[PDB]
Design a protein around this ligand. Structure first.
Ligand code: 0GS
Length: 375
């Protein structure tokens, strides 16, 4: 039941969101990062300073060794492992157990994070981007093939963890309309941005620029990441809007804190960002609106806790647009694989203050008939 799956996520935008899973027989419990930006299921399978626990294959009587290796480099971080299959379940997910491919991680570099509380990663994207290649069936594909569970899941990520609902839409997790954008190609969850506004002002670029290389929805990435040209325009607009405030050297590069007296963060001087996504009907679109409460990521540190401190959670990308966790937060996002579309609605934990709120609004119509896809 969906009600049983509500609030089955913990974690952060910055260090990711994780769900409890089990692997092996008898079941070994692990926390697993939920990642719509990759397609491998991999778990720590050897001791590591940052691992609280790990998959012990010798204690699983249902483990099968595939006698093959696998290497996965992400944008940051990488791991190497041995492939096998074993029985996998999600205690606070669907009431099923399936046999799935598992990469047992034996070596890693800057993959595991100190204090994150997860021990593996669940890549929920498509086989096309699986390593070593597309012949390695991803977990969700195995889940759908071996059970009767409908081919879709939804994510409700919440900031200061959320819910992953597998097999259907939980109407209790959103208000207002659910708006759908097509999945352009089934590899990453690739979508098309047709228009960008910052505080109501159109950036006025050829819309292909917004999707340069590609645009994807990626729960495993913290920031909104933008192609260079779009990033520079965004920073220009946000800097102009917040000009009454002085920001530290390096703030706009995303690795320097800015702090304000507790409760006094000047939210109002930062603009809202609107991303218009391609609709299901020709030249119609809808927008999701992003508040500074989203793109200024709070950095919890007891040492700095006399004040409220933030990092700028928009970054320049070399890999195309990435709608990461800070974008997904506050929205109910439906990965409707069966109908090749992604839905957005306002969730119960959407960000807002007394003047402004995150929103999903449509339809909007565009005159120009250009295809905004880059490829
Ligand atoms: C082919 C591939 F593996 F799917 C691939 C390769 C490069 C980029 C992408 C896009 N998705 C990536 C973006 S990322 O910033 O590297 C985070 C990564 C998951 C991840 C890896 C990590 F280490 C750590 N700590 C954390 Br937290 C989270 C996503 O998965 C996918």
């Amino acid at each position: 039941s969906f009600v049983e799956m509500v609030d089955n996520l913990r974690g952060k935008s910055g260090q990711g969101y994780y769900v409890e899973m089990t692997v092996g027989s008898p079941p070994q419990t692990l926390n697993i990062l939920v990642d719509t930006g990759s397609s491998n299921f991999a778990v720590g399978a050897a001791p590591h300073p940052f691992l609280h626990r790990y998959y012990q294959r010798q204690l699983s009587s249902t483990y099968r060794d595939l006698r093959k290796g696998v290497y996965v480099p992400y944008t940051q971080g990488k791991w190497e492992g041995e492939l096998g299959t074993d029985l996998v379940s999600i205690p606070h997910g669907p009431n099923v157990t399936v046999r799935a491919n598992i990469a047992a991680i034996t070596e890693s570099d800057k993959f595991f994070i100190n204090g994150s509380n997860w021990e593996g990663i669940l890549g929920l994207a498509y086989a096309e981007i699986a390593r070593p290649d597309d012949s390695l069936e991803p977990f969700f594909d195995s889940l759908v093939k071996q059970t009767h569970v409908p081919n879709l899941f939804s994510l409700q990520l919440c900031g200061a963890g959320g819910s992953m609902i597998i097999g259907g839409i939980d109407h209790s997790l959103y208000t207002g309309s659910l708006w759908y954008t097509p999945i352009r190609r089934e590899w990453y969850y690739e979508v098309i941005i047709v228009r960008v506004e910052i505080n109501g002002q159109d950036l006025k670029m050829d819309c292909k620029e917004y999707n340069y290389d590609k645009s994807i929805v990626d729960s495993g990435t913290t920031n909104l990441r933008l192609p260079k040209k779009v990033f520079e325009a965004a920073v220009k607009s946000i800097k102009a809007a917040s000009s009454t405030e002085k920001f530290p050297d390096g703030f706009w590069l995303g690795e320097q804190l800015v702090c304000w007296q507790a409760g006094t963060t000047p939210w109002n001087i930062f603009p809202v960002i609107s991303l218009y996504l391609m609709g299901e009907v020709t030249n119609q679109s809808f927008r999701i609106t992003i508040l500074p409460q989203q793109y200024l990521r709070p950095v919890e540190d007891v040492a700095t806790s006399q004040d409220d401190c933030y990092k700028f959670a928009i970054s320049q990308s070399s890999t195309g647009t990435v709608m990461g966790a800070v974008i997904m937060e506050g929205f109910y996002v439906v990965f409707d694989r069966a109908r090749k579309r992604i839905g957005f609605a306002v969730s119960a934990c959407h960000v807002h203050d007394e003047f402004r709120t995150a929103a999903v609004e449509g339809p909007f119509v565009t005159l120009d008939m250009e295809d905004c896809g880059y490829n």
